[PDB]
Write a protein that binds this ligand. Structure first.
Ligand SMILES: [Fe+3]
Ligand SMILES: [Fe+3]
Ligand SMILES: [Fe+3]
Ligand SMILES: [Fe+3]
Lengths: 388, 510, 166, 388, 510
């Protein structure tokens, strides 16, 4: 009706007076800061830290936990809900990690939402502006639809590699970062399909069906080793840290960066394609956002751990060697794609220089952080063997 | 050259084809079931659109909280008892939201169909949102309320008391430890569908009634996401229905999941509602019967009959053991008030009438006991009295169910009075029901949780409280209190003077 | 000193652990600790309140020593005892599949954990084991879960019934 | 204090009790829809129309006005606050116009805010990803810093052309669109400087000062006619409608669209420059946005006015011809810029194709609307006469 | 490869150089001053950052409104009198915000320095936001309030009454017609600095006091933008301070601007506060003296001293005419209640005591009159009495100042009672003060606004009302009312039966 039936304590005269009368003269404690006991990473405690740190009910027997005692219910056989046994890495405190971008859920969906709506505006402006007219047909129907399209499966696989980590992460801050690294990968795979669906609307005859790209991924040669690496990272790794580390600090940092930035971002422009770079901009931004988090966890927190620095670097060096070979194989097979381009698109020197950029960035941003002795020319020479 | 774009459904149409075949493409987790490879999902979302729909909700929520609600001093104008109740309600729910993240990550790993993985993924992200939302409620009340203690450090001060243990069983370990399907039943088919979805709404009502408009703002927003999780639970059943293993194990895992959830909720939710409020909304007795029996155990569960799902065989015992459950528990929670992170209050005259009115016989049992305790000076710091002493004097031991962690006092309870004590390989175990007992007997290694008496044995009360930071910023006054008034607050010294020392009640048995 | 998070027992074990400076000695002490203090089959419940924490400290030492002693291939594929991890995993799964009943199955799974829980076995193999062993154990246990009366189940488990109220 | 000293009628028991007691049993009118008397352009009245239509207090002597009488205070001499005398165009109702995007202030700043935040994120990812490494130094230090930067004065000039219209517009719906059209123009100009400032930060010797690009605009040959047309559309036009129509449906639709889309947007990619296209994507999205509004006002409302259809078309055809010449001239001069490009960048076959795109697009979107009969060949021919 | 970006300030550093020289690069508007083209602005903003800072405010605001406030039924639990008052406050302010757009657009054109243009431009956009915000307030009260009539159509129903004309003079025409600098003085130097900035805040105070939390949510958000406009007005003076024309014309345009603005707000604003509310915040006399004499006339004007700015010479005159101004006007507003788009209420007992306490002599004049009118049945439709009749009976003519449009009644007023009547080329003109008289004598062609008596002359009251849609949805009940109760509402017929016919009061001198 008018005022409704339900009476509310905040506005109902009778109820509010009863409430007001029971109130103390002033707060029963002046410490009005939730999470006041959390060691701040920065000058002052951030909202990101207060709302996140210690949400995970770990007992002290899992490094950094504040609770005590065993879990209340475990797996058949005895496996603990969460335990040290789920990863080879050790630390003095699993809650030390901090996403440098301080992303909790609200900030995270806010930014992705801005990107979504702006993406919509971009496409409507792109289509209304008829910019598709200047795109090379072959590049569009062959390289974007088949090869860029096949790459969605690569990103989809890397997304899935995160499933076990979402379940096993030993702290809130690591779980949140991990969940967001994985979510951004599925987003990219979906944006790759989004572009194909958009082209199917503005280009007569373009088929948005994933059949072609999927056949390329599952049975082609260009992505054969890439797919083999992805299947391994995702399903053969049962260690949540080996998974996240190898995915972001080895495979995606080398293969991913090469394909996205040194192939498609670098060549699409040459074929009158401003469309693909729009989506790759998002993928590279996400890649750089993830890197900060990946570096803080594996290098700042674990690789530099006051008690397990040496141990952790040994393990990560191990993982890097383990996954570098399959990653090189991935790049090597991808080299086969250059032979498909129209003559004069690019040459061996540009390709080589671009490989070195990716390798040098990787050595600086990752390898060097754990003292992994990477030989850049040896890596590039191994890859170049794939050029036909 | 017309303005065109692409939406979520248009991309989702092809999402199912994203997964591909390879020898090792299979779940990394132990399970008796096989989730169908072609299982589909109800909502056709992609990451971008998911973020947008949640982003919109956040704006409204935080807008109300930071603007109008703050201007109205909504964080203060709440009944003292409800400000305390939210310390527990919001932080305990927080852990459920948190563990549900890991739970759905485990289900995402279990599903083989890309669409089913995608559905679980949406929940993974929603449960992170909910974790942060529940955190924000405590965060808001600590910053703007009448008593920040507890609201501001529950993540560590919750570890002092026994109610927290049971919460971890149903909202933490029950969600992620076991067959992924068993976990899905605890979380989605039972947890959310039976208890959480109705619970979240009920809390907003009790909150509004007691002057709290902060919680309604956040929780009502949380509720908008639940529809998707319901569908995930439902789809879990569909995905495994045409598998022979289903007929063999589904109803057993479901029955166990139901008893697990119910065992804790039945007494705790009702206790927080009726004893943690000033203004009442509805008697827990009827709320429970409508929720569990009517809505869930009838409408909802019957819809899954076509998949072999049957009504939990322990449903009858749950109802019989429900009537006095919460009343029996508050006696224990109040007697052990020094172990909490919130302030408790004895029922006032007007409340006792309500209780008696709604639960005939309440006064002759609980009513008189509370009257005796206040006569003994339980609210006065100089009395040197803690209700626990009364339990000792009248030989009423308090035990902790080895499985559910729920505290019980069989000699003094009006509800269940069962007690089974077993000795196995040098350790004593105490059970309060025939369902939890079977669980332990069949799965001894899944239930080794040490109880507070076991961990605190031989320790003086004030020492446990001090060690686990159960103090206010002045470093002397206890966070927990036996009354909700602003004066005469008990200090650590008042408790030490009591010289109360913990002992393991089971050690009496030979 | 009798605290929850810090006490004499914990301090004493930290000292014992500091004196384990050889992989074989440390690994053997970890496994012995697990036989003595973990699972409902532990040889004793004397360390019930601190074993979880002490076990982690012992694991830390074994991990550190193993990483220093093993080459990269062995760190990934050998147990701390020098056994080939895949062989152990497969052999244990084979035993589990041959298990005649749920009672034999629980012994296999629980024992596997006590003996090979990571710093001993590489986590990759170990969790693959959990995946496989846990499945069979549950398949056997959850079949006709309620048929056996509590009176008889208590006998099967072999508990000593101390007291009953109903 | 904890409760404060101010008592609020919504929560204070005493005050709320008095208020509640004075309330009627039900609303005193069931028509709870503000702006219910406004004629909906679409199925149902939108928030956009409700909150905007009739905010301007025009009297009936200004077509569409709902008020009566003269203004309360006029200019010295007698000129009215607002009057029919400020534009040649006539109409049955100045309130007819509707922005197809239905933009009132909130949606407008929401979208631009998302773009600002994206933008910041993109620049951060760009720099961290080191994408500048693949950009042509000459194209950067010479075509982006000098020629693109000089174009900012063009957009800045079109921005200012809107000032008088922000003062003279005869309705709210028209005034709101106009303001946004001009605000988007200043934004573009500011984005051009932003890019140069960004380049200045990542390219050690790059100078962000507007000195160079300014002198090019003020004393160059490339944009001489461009600047002449701008200075005229801005300070020689005193008719708000001629200014708006001539800027958006003539000049910027031809010269602007060519420079932005057919030159920098089309050629930048060929020099490993995905940075500039990022900002041009905004300018074009903005252009297409303002286009729907420009079309609805001058064609849907005026050009097709139930009583002044023929009349308005005559005036706009007249305006089209009046400014088509200075616009065609601005283009010719710009053609001189191709001669400064490194050999092999593009050929007359391509430029001819791009010019026909701009012209054909113009004829399709503007020219044919008012029935100005334009010859694509003659225009393209006259413009093309500016090479070597 | 460090993550890098560029902020607003870094781009704004080069904004001044954006403008270039050329023959016709000058203002298109007539003006006696020369704004220096080296003038700078206080806030270094660019379009994108501006959008972001405003978008964030919108979030809070609309979030509070759509969520918490709606859940609290904030649109309803407001005093009837205040619900009516907001129909006038929000819509009348809306026009000020709207014309301010055109005004700052004119100033944008007037400025030559790129930075000064940029400052004015930011205001252009702000005033658009405020227009929409004020519209939203009426929109929300129309959608969720106790009486939508008026809130839903003020844009057309405001044209019926005389109060609207005066509002257009200070908030529409005063803002855009004349020397750009005169307009700036009316809008920013006087309007915003002296009245609106303080007024907006005060309104939120009176609103809160009367149960309205909707207006505070929106108006406080509007308020956050005002600092930019203050600076614009301040910079306007700095821009022309070095031009010789300034020392010759500035103080005259300011004085005129000052008198113009105060002439309307002094009576009207005080009337809306004290007579459009139940609960009072502060007597208008006290508020006025603080705002005009101290804060503005003293502190604010003082800071412009170094630029040749002196206190308006008409200041003393304004203060003498102020004291009873609002009280005198409400008599006219109520007497002519059928011409409004709002409902009026006579002071209740508590209110009359409040008025007498704060305005000695109030009761013996206004109080007795109101009681006389009420006892005669002015609130009852069957009485056949409308206060206007009482004015005719006691020969108390009501005139409209040809310049300010403010209604005045010389024979009854307790305040100013001067009256000047003139004939010029076949037309009569009535003036209420010496300043406005001078304005007309010197600028005849700037002031030809027809008054309500002139337009409605010979017309029967109900016909004017019907013609201008002064009716509620049922097509019979008047929007306007002489009381704020839910029963006995006046209809078009109740008015028609009175046979009231408008007459031009000035013709009596013929
Ligand atoms: Fe949830
Ligand atoms: Fe959920
Ligand atoms: Fe404003
Ligand atoms: Fe303003």
């Amino acid at each position: 009706s008018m005022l409704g039936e339900r009476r509310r304590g905040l506005t109902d005269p009778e109820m509010a007076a009863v409430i007001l009368k029971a109130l103390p003269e002033a707060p029963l404690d002046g410490n009005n800061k939730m999470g006041y006991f959390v060691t701040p990473r920065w000058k002052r405690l951030t909202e990101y830290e207060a709302l996140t740190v210690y949400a995970q009910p770990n007992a002290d027997w899992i490094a950094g936990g504040l609770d005590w005692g065993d879990w209340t219910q475990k797996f058949h056989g005895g496996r603990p809900s969460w335990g040290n046994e789920t990863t080879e890495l050790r630390t003095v405190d699993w809650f030390k990690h901090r996403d440098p971008l301080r992303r909790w859920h609200a900030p995270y969906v806010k930014d992705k939402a801005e990107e979504w709506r702006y993406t919509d505006r971009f496409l409507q402006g792109y289509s209304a502006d008829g910019q598709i007219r200047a795109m090379n047909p072959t590049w569009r129907d062959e390289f974007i639809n088949r090869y860029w399209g096949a790459f969605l499966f690569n990103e989809y696989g890397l997304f899935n590699a995160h499933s076990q980590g979402a379940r096993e992460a030993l702290s809130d801050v690591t779980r949140v970062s991990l969940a967001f690294w994985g979510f951004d990968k599925i987003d990219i795979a979906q944006m790759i399909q989004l572009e194909r669906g958009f082209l199917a609307k503005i280009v007569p005859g373009f088929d948005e069906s994933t059949a072609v790209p999927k056949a390329e991924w599952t049975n082609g040669e260009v992505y054969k080793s890439a797919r083999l690496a992805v299947e391994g990272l995702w399903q053969e790794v049962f260690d949540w840290n080996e998974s996240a580390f190898s995915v972001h600090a080895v495979y995606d940092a080398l293969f991913g960066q090469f394909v996205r930035r040194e192939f498609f971002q670098r060549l699409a422009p040459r074929f009158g394609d401003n469309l693909t770079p729009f989506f790759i901009n998002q993928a590279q931004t996400y890649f750089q956002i993830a890197k900060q988090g990946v570096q803080d966890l594996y290098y700042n927190c674990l690789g530099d751990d006051p008690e397990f620095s040496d141990y952790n670097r040994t393990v990560m060096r191990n993982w890097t060697g383990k996954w570098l070979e399959p990653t090189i194989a991935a790049l090597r097979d991808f080299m086969g794609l250059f032979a498909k381009l129209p003559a004069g698109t690019t040459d061996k020197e540009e390709i080589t220089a671009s490989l070195y950029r990716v390798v040098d960035d990787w050595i600086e941003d990752y390898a060097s952080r754990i003292d992994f002795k990477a030989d850049r020319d040896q890596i590039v020479k191994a890859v170049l063997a794939g050029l036909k | 050259r017309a303005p065109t774009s692409v939406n979520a459904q248009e991309v989702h149409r092809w999402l199912q084809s994203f997964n591909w075949d390879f020898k090792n493409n299979r779940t990394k987790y132990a399970t008796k079931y096989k989730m169908a490879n072609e299982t589909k999902e109800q909502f056709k979302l992609i990451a971008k659109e998911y973020a947008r729909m949640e982003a919109v909700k956040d704006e409204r929520q935080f807008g109300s909280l930071q603007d109008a609600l703050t201007r109205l001093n909504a964080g203060v104008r709440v009944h003292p008892k409800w400000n305390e109740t939210m310390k527990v309600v919001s932080n305990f729910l927080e852990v459920g939201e948190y563990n549900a993240i890991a739970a759905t990550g485990m289900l995402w790993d279990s599903a083989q169909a890309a669409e089913q993985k995608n559905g679980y993924l949406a929940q993974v992200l929603d449960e992170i949102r909910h974790t942060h939302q529940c955190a924000y409620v405590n965060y808001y009340f600590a910053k703007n309320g009448q008593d920040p203690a507890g609201h501001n450090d529950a993540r560590r001060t919750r570890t002092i008391g026994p109610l927290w243990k049971g919460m971890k069983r149903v909202f933490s370990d029950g969600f992620i430890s076991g067959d992924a399907v068993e976990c899905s039943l605890n979380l989605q088919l039972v947890g959310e569908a039976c208890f959480t979805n109705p619970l979240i709404v009920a809390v907003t009502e009790w909150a509004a009634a007691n002057g709290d408009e902060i919680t309604p703002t956040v929780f009502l927003s949380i509720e908008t996401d639940e529809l998707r999780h319901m569908a995930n639970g439902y789809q879990t059943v569909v995905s495994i229905a045409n598998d022979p293993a289903s007929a063999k194990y589904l109803n057993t895992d479901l029955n166990n999941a139901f008893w697990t959830q119910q065992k804790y909720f039945t007494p705790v939710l009702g206790m927080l509602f009726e004893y943690g409020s000033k203004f009442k909304v509805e008697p827990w007795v009827k709320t429970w019967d409508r929720w569990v029996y009517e809505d869930w155990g009838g409408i909802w569960i019957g819809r899954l009959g076509k998949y072999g799902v049957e009504s939990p065989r322990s449903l009858k015992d749950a109802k019989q053991d429900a009537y006095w459950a919460h009343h029996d528990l508050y006696l224990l929670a109040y007697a052990l008030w020094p172990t909490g992170f919130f302030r408790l209050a004895l029922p006032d005259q007007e409340e006792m009438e309500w209780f008696e009115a709604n639960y005939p016989g309440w006064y002759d049992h609980y009513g008189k006991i509370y009257e005796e305790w206040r006569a003994r000076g339980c609210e006065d710091p100089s009395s040197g009295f803690i209700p626990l002493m009364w339990f000792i004097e009248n030989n009423h031991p308090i035990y902790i169910d080895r499985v559910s962690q729920v505290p019980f006092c069989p000699s003094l309870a009006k509800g269940a009075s069962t007690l089974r004590v077993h000795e196995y390989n040098g350790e004593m175990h105490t059970f309060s029901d025939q369902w939890g007992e079977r669980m332990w007997l069949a799965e001894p290694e899944r239930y080794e949780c040490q109880n507070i008496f076991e961990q605190y044995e031989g320790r003086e009360l004030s020492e446990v409280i001090a060690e686990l930071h159960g103090l206010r910023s002045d470093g002397k006054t206890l966070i927990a209190q036996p009354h909700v008034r602003g004066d005469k607050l008990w200090t650590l010294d008042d408790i030490k003077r009591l010289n109360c020392v913990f002992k393991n009640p089971v050690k009496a048995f030979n | 000193k009798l605290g929850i998070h810090s006490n004499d027992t914990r301090d004493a074990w930290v000292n014992k652990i500091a004196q384990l400076n050889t992989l074989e000695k440390a690994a053997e002490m970890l496994k012995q600790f697990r036989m003595d203090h973990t699972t409902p089959f532990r040889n004793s419940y004397e360390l019930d309140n601190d074993y979880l924490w002490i076990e982690a400290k012992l694991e830390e030492k074994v991990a550190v020593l193993k990483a220093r002693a093993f080459n990269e291939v062995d760190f990934r594929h050998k147990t701390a005892f020098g056994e080939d991890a895949k062989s152990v995993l497969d052999g244990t799964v084979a035993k589990m599949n041959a298990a005649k009943d749920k009672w034999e199955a629980e012994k296999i799974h629980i024992g596997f954990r006590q003996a090979y829980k990571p710093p001993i076995m590489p986590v990759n193999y170990f969790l693959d084991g959990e995946r496989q062993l846990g499945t069979r154990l549950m398949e056997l246990r959850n079949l006709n879960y309620y048929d056996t009366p509590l009176e008889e189940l208590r006998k099967q488990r072999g508990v000593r019934v101390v007291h009953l109220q109903s």
